[PDB]
Design a protein around this ligand. Structure first.
Ligand SMILES: Cc1ccc(O)c(C)c1-c1cc(-c2ccnc(N3CCCNCC3)c2)cc(C(N)=O)c1N
Length: 273
C-alpha cells in the first residue's frame, strides 16, 4: 500500500480520487513533453485537469533515502515559497510528495537563456532586456533577505515579449545548507565562503557577459582569475557596445563592498523601463 500524496509547504485536491491507484501527478495532469532531465530530476510541460492551464512540474529522480535527504529536498519548497510572486521570478503553484518523490508545480516558462543562446550572437536589445528583468529579480530576492548562489544562463527562463524569469531556488541562501554553484559564474568572495547581496549581482554580470559574447567562460585557472580583476578581457568584448561593457564592469567589481547594487543598476538611465 502507498500513502496518499501530501502537500509540501512551510506556511502551515480538485479532481483527484484517492480510491484509484494512479498517482496525484498522473490523475491530475496531462503530460505534454519533457523539458529537461538530469540528477536534479525531470521537468515536464503539463496541462492541469483542475483549471485547464499549462504548467511545468519538476519531480525528483529517486525516493528519499532517509529523513535528512527528505528534509534537504523539501527545503527547496520553503525557499521557493519565500520568493513568492514576482513577474521576474518563476512562480511556484503547489508542491507535494508521493511515493518518496518530491513534485514542484510552477508556472510554465519558455526555454532557458542557455537554450535560447544555443539555438540563436544575440541582438543587444534582447540582452538589455534579460539583464533588466533578472536585476529586478535580484532586487526582489534581496528584499526578502535572499541570495541566489547559482545565477547562470540555464537558470533564467524566457517569457512573453522579451521577458525572463529567474528560477532554481534550491540554490537560495538566507541572510542554510546549499550546494555548489557553477564556478564559471561564482563571485570571487565565495572562495572564502563570504556571501551577501553582492554575490548574485556578480554572477548575473558573468551570465550576461557569456550570453552577449557567446563564448565559454573559464571554470578555473588564470582565465578565471583574470575575469575577477575589475576589467573585461578583450577576448570577451568583441562586438559588445560601450554602454553594455560599462554596466558589466560595474557588476564585475571584485570587491563586494564596492560592487554596484541591483537597485543602483536599475536606477541607471540605460536601464530605464
Ligand atoms: C518545474 C520547475 C520547478 C522549480 C523551478 O525553480 C523551476 C525553474 C522549474 C522549471 C524548470 C525547468 C527546467 C528545464 C530544463 N532544465 C532545468 N534544469 C534545472 C535547473 C538548473 N539547470 C539545470 C537544468 C530546468 C523549466 C521550467 C519551465 N520552462 O517552465 C520550469 N518552470
Amino acid at each position: 500500500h502507498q500513502l496518499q500524496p501530501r502537500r509540501v509547504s512551510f506556511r502551515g485536491s480538485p479532481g483527484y480520487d484517492p480510491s484509484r491507484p494512479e498517482s496525484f501527478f498522473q490523475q491530475s495532469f496531462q503530460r505534454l513533453s519533457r523539458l529537461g532531465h538530469g540528477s536534479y530530476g525531470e521537468v515536464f510541460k503539463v496541462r492541469s485537469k483542475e483549471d485547464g492551464r499549462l504548467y511545468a512540474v519538476k519531480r525528483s529522480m529517486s525516493p528519499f533515502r532517509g529523513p535528512k535527504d527528505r528534509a534537504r529536498k523539501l527545503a527547496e519548497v520553503g525557499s521557493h515559497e519565500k520568493v513568492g510572486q514576482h513577474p521576474c521570478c518563476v512562480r511556484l503553484e503547489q508542491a507535494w510528495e508521493e511515493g518518496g518523490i518530491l513534485y514542484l508545480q510552477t508556472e510554465l516558462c519558455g526555454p532557458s537563456l542557455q537554450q535560447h543562446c544555443e539555438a540563436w550572437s544575440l541582438p543587444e536589445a534582447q540582452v538589455w532586456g534579460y539583464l533588466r528583468d533578472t536585476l529586478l529579480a535580484l532586487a526582489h530576492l534581496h528584499s526578502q533577505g535572499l541570495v541566489h548562489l547559482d545565477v547562470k544562463p540555464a537558470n533564467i527562463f524566457l517569457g512573453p515579449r522579451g521577458r525572463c524569469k529567474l528560477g532554481d531556488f534550491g540554490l537560495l541562501v538566507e541572510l542554510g545548507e546549499v550546494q555548489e554553484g557553477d564556478p564559471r559564474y561564482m563571485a570571487p568572495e565565495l572562495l572564502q565562503g563570504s556571501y551577501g547581496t553582492a554575490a548574485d549581482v556578480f554572477s548575473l554580470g558573468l551570465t550576461i557577459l557569456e550570453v552577449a559574447c557567446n563564448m565559454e567562460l573559464p571554470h578555473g585557472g588564470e582565465g578565471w582569475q583574470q575575469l575577477r580583476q575589475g576589467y573585461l578581457p578583450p577576448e570577451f568584448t568583441a562586438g559588445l557596445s560601450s554602454e553594455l561593457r560599462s554596466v558589466l564592469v560595474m557588476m564585475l567589481e571584485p570587491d563586494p563592498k564596492l560592487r554596484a547594487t541591483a537597485e543602483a543598476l536599475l536606477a541607471l538611465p540605460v536601464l530605464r523601463q
